[model samples]
Every structure is written in structure tokens, then in C-alpha cells.
Target: QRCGEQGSNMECPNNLCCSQYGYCGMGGDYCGKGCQNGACWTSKRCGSQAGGATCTNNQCCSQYGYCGFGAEYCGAGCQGGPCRADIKCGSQAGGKLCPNNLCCSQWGFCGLGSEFCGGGCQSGACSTDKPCGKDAGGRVCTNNYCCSKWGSCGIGPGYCGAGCQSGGCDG
Candidate 1:
């Protein structure tokens, strides 16, 4: 069912959650904080603030704003570039996860701290050390510094992962 956005949006099925935009699904993309109703079973946790277009690397960006291979990230709620789903975790998403020590979001995504770890982000390898970003109190980092997805300032894929901040990152 089409749902969520402005006034008088439609409700989802019994077991479905309303995607933030006006769609229906059962994954976190539809059931998480952005959900309108129906199958909403979350937050009641973290996260608040928060995508785009081919999706650059020919890969796909999940409906929930995550990027990845396919299936989970490209199945149910595929967004502009692709729909989305999961762990590959989550009861509905299924089992398996944490690709290379990275955290697995409650919603079912294998990404870095920026995508799933600590504070508002959402599990493993979580570290506030050197945390630097707009979310934190850290001011605008000048040159020579680093910028990862989360506030943590570091190098390598561990923090930077795919595309942390872009220009500010040194590596």
C-alpha cells in the first residue's frame, strides 16, 4: 500500500510497514524510524538525521540509504538506484552478517560506524575515540586531518569505508 508523506496517507497491510515516502514493505526501510504505521516495531532506539542516484559505481543504494551488492540491498525496497532488504540480521531480514568486523545494523546492513554503530548511528567495532564530524561537537576539521563516516577520524577502510566525507578525507 502507498503510505507516508503528507496528510492522509494510506496504511500498510497487517504485517507490512509504511515506507517513509509512500510505499510498503517489511524491512527496516519501511519499518524503522521512517515508518508511518502498520508493521512499525522499532524506535520506540536510536538514529534521527539522515541519498541518491546507477548509483555511481554501477552498484545500488538501498531504499534505506545504504549501498551494496544486491539482494538484501537491492531487493524489496530498492530506491532510486535500487531497492533494499537485509543481513544478511533482523528477524525478517534473516541471519548472517558483519562483513569483516564491520557492524551489522539492527535493520540488517553490513557497514561501518557511519552506517551502523554507536550513539545515533546504530554495533561492532564502535569507538568514539577521535570522533570528528558535524554530529559531534568537533568543529570543522582543517586540512591534514581526516573524516570518516561516523565522527571517528581515521584512515583505511576501517573508518573511511566507502565514501566517508569526500574532500576532507586524507587517507
Candidate 2:
């Protein structure tokens, strides 16, 4: 039946109501998805619509006017551009890239220290023998060469205990 024609003979089904805007429906949209001057829709379609569209619970609206629960419509996929949500891992995600010489932590965090860039360092950038004493004129000191106070690489307590620079001290 033509439920909402202007000044025309129209009738809705037994359970349907003539929408104020001109249509037949059983829900409030026919009555008031919020109507004014007797004009309204039977139900507001939240997806692919302009502003003011309503979304279902647990659902997010995309920039394209579509309601969805997927990552594209939720997380980093929707920072008003792609979207926004929790990151899952992998080379591609959110945040600054790990430093050139640092490692990315298992939890997505990055660092160069043991807890972050040392023992468990993963995703490349592993330097086990990170420069130990590369300061004094590029001097190559033995394992015992105690970094000296005068910036000279040595091993005796004069340089090791007092102003040692790199390794341990002897005598």
C-alpha cells in the first residue's frame, strides 16, 4: 500500500505504520528516526551515509561512511586516514622505525641496551662486540688494557684502578 503519499489514499500492512515522510515500516524510523514537519525516514542507514549516521554496538564507522568491525575501519587503519587500533607486530605497524643500529623489542618497543638491544636483540642490528674501547686514538688495547686516565690504553693499576677507561685492571 502507498503508506505515505501526500493527501493520497494509502494504507500500510497490519503491522506496518505509515512513515511520516511517506513510506510503510514497523520501526521508529517510520515514526521518528527523528522527524520534523512530518518528514522522516523509516530507518537511518549508518553505512555509506553522510554525517550523523549511527553505528551498531562494537562497530566503527569508516571515512567512507561504512560501518565495520575490521581493522581497516578500527585501528592504525583509521587515524582519520587509514584507521586506529592496537598494533599486531611485524615490520609494518605504527611508531618510528627502530634506530639504524638498534633492535626492535619483542613487544614492538625499541632500544640498544641489553634488555632492548643486547641479549634478546632481534630483527637485525645485532652487535655482540659493540665497540669497547674505540676512543683513545683508535688504540687497540688487549682484554687487560685498562683504559688509562691520560686517555692512553694500558693495563697496570695506574691506569686501570684510578682512571681506567675500557677493560679490567691488573697489578
Candidate 3:
């Protein structure tokens, strides 16, 4: 895919491999210029261009939409796609690379919100004011005292259920 002033061609001027998204992959090494859709990839590393000849398996697109070594997905959302690390995705970033917070946050949020919870939690509005006892977010156990932190409850898991609404603990 050219995607440049010249046009969309399967091959670049020199010894380059035109990715489906219109980027020059010279011998699977580095993307010279005119990169569209995604960044230039070298299979194992999808950032800067190495000094190879072609974008082979170890250079780029090892399996499926995945790119690089160990079959790491370089795309976005999940892994091994077009949304790698550097790419921009809403407030987050994406592209053909995996950054520190990108993959973890993306997959975690996606999986947790969609797979586990179905629809993400409203606002993650947990009761930070009080960890145990009678509090605005959680009620008191028996007594009229509410611990500001959950650790206050030594033995039990330390919960703020019905037992906390009316009060329970002595202190």
C-alpha cells in the first residue's frame, strides 16, 4: 500500500515491502518514510527501522495481526493488532508497540469492564472516607464508631455491610 504522493503500491521504490496499511518495509528492516495507518515495523521491533533487508517474521508481523518476537501483538485495544503502543486511542495511546501502561491498562480495563462486569462500574465510587464502621459510603456495624481505614478491622476481612450501618465496633 503506497498511501503516499506516489500511490499505493505493493512495493516501495527500493527493496521495501509495502504493508497492507501503506508503509515501506525495506527488507523487513525499517520503514523509510510515508507511513500511513500504522508505524513502520521490523517484526520483532515495531518502532525504528533496523539495518536488515526485509521485514521477515523476526522483523515484523510474525503471526496473524501480531508483530515482533514471542508473537507479541503490536496493534491496539488488546495485543497483536494495528493499535500498537505509540498509536493514539482516545485519551490513551496505541500503535504497533507495547508501552508500559498501554497494554496493561487497555486489556485490564477492557477485559474487566466488558468480560467481568459487562458494563464498567459507574464511577469507581468506593467509600474512601471510611474503611469500616458507620460511614457515608458504608454504615456502622454496631457502635457509633467508624474506622477511616479497612485495616482497622484486625481479624475479619473488615467489611462495612449492614453491621456497619447501625454501628457495631466498640471503639
Candidate 4:
């Protein structure tokens, strides 16, 4: 729906905010874009443009608010949605996109080897079932979780052992 534009209704999806320019998005950029009319999503989710209105299953939402599975939709600007299990090495948490096969570093940048995969590797490609060798970013785990020596992030003693960088271990 159009927001600030003419004849715009601003009909965004459940977890998305309509911009003043009549676009669906999340975060401050869309919510705070001179929004005279209030009402935005508190979290992230999928959207549609072909009158679908919602994403099937837990598909990742594209920057444009459509539901689909792919690096284009799951990586980088993916706002609110689920990561594609089949696809590896893509952005799902935050706006960081990993380059090539390089692991998504905890800092959100891209690189190779343990330095990028171990510890600090919060989300994205390396956040899958794999151990990521073990670590995370600058944020603390509200639950019982911590960093690992392999440089990846995880839960409990495995992640709380030596080489624990970033935030401390909990529980």
C-alpha cells in the first residue's frame, strides 16, 4: 500500500512496516521514514506482492517483502524470515552477507579459515547445525549459551571453554 504517496494505503505484511514512500520493510529505515501514520512490525517475517500477503512455511522474506528460498532472498537485506536449511552460506541474522564459501564472521563481514568461522560467527551461513569450530559477536547470550575455542558460538561448556571471545558464557 502507498504510505506518503498518493492514494496509498500502506498495506504491509504482518512483520513489516509501510514506508512513507509506500514500501514494505522493517527497522528504523522503513518505520522512521517520516512515518506520519504509526504501526509497524516489532519483529521480522515474510511478505508477498502478488496478493499472497504471507510466506508459506518458514521461508525467508526478501528485502522487497516477498517469500522465497534463495541467497538473494535469505542473504544480506533479509529482514524478517527463516533461513533456508538447504542453502548454505547466506545471511539470515542481521544484514551481513558472507562472500563465497567463506564463513559469515561474527562481525558480519566475510573471510576464510577459523578466524572467521570460529567464535564471532553469530549467524548466517555458519550458524547452521555445524559447530563452526566454536564463537560469536559483541552481544551476550540471554540464555545459557557462550563461545567456543574453535571460534564459533554455541551453548553450554562446549562453547564456554577456552578461547571464549566476545560475550561470556551463561548457565
Best by the TM-score measure: 4
Identify the leading candidate in terms of lDDT: 4
lDDT of 3 by residue, 35-130 (tens): 422334433333333232223222233234334433244333323222334332322323222222122223233112233223321111211222
Candidate 3, superposed: residue stretches over 4 Å from native = 1-41, 44-113, 121-171
Cα lDDT of all candidates, in order?
Answer: 0.49, 0.46, 0.33, 0.50
- Please state the error at residue 46 of candidate 2 in Å: 3.6
Backbone clashes, each candidate: 8, 13, 42, 21
Candidates sorted on TM-score, descending = 4, 1, 2, 3
Global fold similarity of model 3 (TM-score): 0.19
Question: What lDDT tens digits, residue by residue, belong to model 2 across residues 1-112?
Answer: 3554542625454534555565666556765653221223332234436555444322345655655546656654332211354323224445334423345555665444
lDDT tens string, model 1, 1-171?
Answer: 356565255555564667678787888777777766555654211112121222322234455655444585567765423234334432434544343344556566656655565443223344434355676665432222355666565556654565466324534
In model 1, the number of clashes is 8
Q: Candidate 2 local accuracy as lDDT?
A: 0.46
Give the root-mean-square deviation of each candidate in angstroms.
14.5, 24.6, 18.4, 14.1
Measured against the true structure, the TM-scores of the candidates, in listed sequence, are: 0.23, 0.19, 0.19, 0.25
